[PDB]
């Protein structure tokens, strides 16, 4: 679950879409605010950092050494490890028994070649047995594997479709609620602007009436002063 709990007065389905210049100005203001204060590496919203290879509870020291060797390679995608001795499983050629070679050394070389040939023959017999088992059960094995893969792909597609449908339903509900709230808020804002204009007009009329009343009061005071002086 996300830890973002900030609330910003944003109505994408109701308020108008900002222009690219307005978006650039908002990004500039955000960059100015980011340059105003330093970033906090110990923020509660930010999760803890990944532990080291030696500090990992699941990574073994051999796995840590392999990870260090992979990271030391300039190309980790093309970092291929050294292959094992696969030339020993091939057909053993006849050794070049020299005339100056001793009988014991030639016998040891022949024994090594015979052991390599016997290992190759055993590997070939195992390959022949595996090929016979493949020719026996390959259609059934391939059908079962294809059915399992198709079922897994269908389950993944069904889960993705259900997630997309839920997201679409949530977006539609949010869009409808935002549209109703935006219509109400637009009506209220137009009413508020009209009321502000009407209050300004009424205040101007009241100021004109107050000026006229002040003129009438000054005329009445002048008439009273003239009547008092003339008496």
């Amino acid at each position: 679950m996300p830890a973002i709990t900030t609330v910003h007065e944003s109505l994408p389905y109701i308020d108008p879409e900002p222009t690219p210049e307005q978006r650039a100005a908002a990004e500039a203001l955000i960059a100015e605010e980011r340059a105003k204060v330093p970033d906090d590496p110990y923020h509660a919203l930010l999760p803890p950092p990944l532990p080291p290879l030696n500090e990992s509870r699941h990574l073994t020291p051999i796995l840590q050494n392999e990870l260090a060797r992979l990271a030391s390679s300039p190309d980790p995608q093309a970092a291929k490890m050294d292959a094992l001795d696969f030339s020993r499983y091939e057909a053993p050629e006849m050794p070049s028994i020299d005339s100056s070679q001793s009988l014991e050394e030639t016998a040891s070389q022949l024994w090594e070649t015979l052991k390599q040939a016997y290992t190759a023959q055993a590997y070939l017999s195992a390959r022949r047995a595996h090929l016979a088992l493949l020719d026996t059960h390959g259609k059934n094995a391939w059908l079962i594997g294809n059915w399992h893969l198709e079922g897994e792909v269908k389950a993944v597609e069904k889960e993705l479709a259900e997630t997309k449908r839920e997201i679409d339903r949530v977006s539609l509900a949010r869009q409808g609620m935002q549209e109703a709230a935006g219509a109400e808020l637009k009506s209220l804002e137009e009413t508020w602007k009209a009321g502000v204009g009407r209050v300004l007009e009424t205040e101007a009329a009241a100021e004109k009436l107050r000026i006229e009343v002040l003129e009438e009061r000054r005329r009445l005071a002048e008439a009273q002063a003239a009547l008092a002086v003339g008496n």
């Binding site: 910003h8 944003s10 009436l209 005329r219």
Partner: protein
């Protein structure tokens, strides 16, 4: 969607408060206009 619902509720409350303030200002302006009209009528009656 949760943030938009909370922001919509807060903005609706703020817009209702602003509309109430604007209506109160309009009512005060109407009362001032009525008082000015009454004062003008009283001044016209006193002068005549």
């Amino acid at each position: 969607r949760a943030s938009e619902e909370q922001a919509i509720q807060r903005r609706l409350e703020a817009l209702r408060a602003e509309v109430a303030f604007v209506s109160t200002r309009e009512r005060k302006a109407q009362e001032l206009y009525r008082k000015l009209r009454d004062e003008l009528e009283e001044l016209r009656l006193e002068q005549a």
